[PDB]
């Protein structure tokens, strides 16, 4: 995620990789949504289930 001049950009790629942890083989990321938030962001938090 990024917030240059607003325009929130979300990049993603879903694949069942080897599954130990962060892989070593290279993988690309395909942008999914690019939406102009145009606000101020300083802090970040994640939700659960």
């Amino acid at each position: 995620f990024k917030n240059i001049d607003g325009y929130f950009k979300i990049y993603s790629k879903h694949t069942p990789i080897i599954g130990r942890d962060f892989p070593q083989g290279f993988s690309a990321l395909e942008p999914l949504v690019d939406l102009p938030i145009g606000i101020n962001i300083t802090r970040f938090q994640t939700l659960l289930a």
Binding site: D5, G6, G38, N40
Partner: protein
Amino acid sequence: NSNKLDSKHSGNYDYWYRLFRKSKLKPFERDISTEIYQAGNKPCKGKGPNCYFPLQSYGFRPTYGVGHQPYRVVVLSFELLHAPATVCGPKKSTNL
């Protein structure tokens, strides 16, 4: 120039503008807040000496000078970059 809606008898002080901010504004960034400016070293919170309200009234009256008239300003931002566009003008559709 908009003096017919932004002016009335006995004045109108509804508008606002900021003169006291700790730092600069970055382009296209809003800083709506009411925090009293720090003067000297006092953590003072309030009005009076060395404790100034960040924004003062932009009061407008029907009888001001041209430089003091209630000018109405609207700006338009464009993005002339390589991306799927949304807004156009006249449109013809001659077949490819």
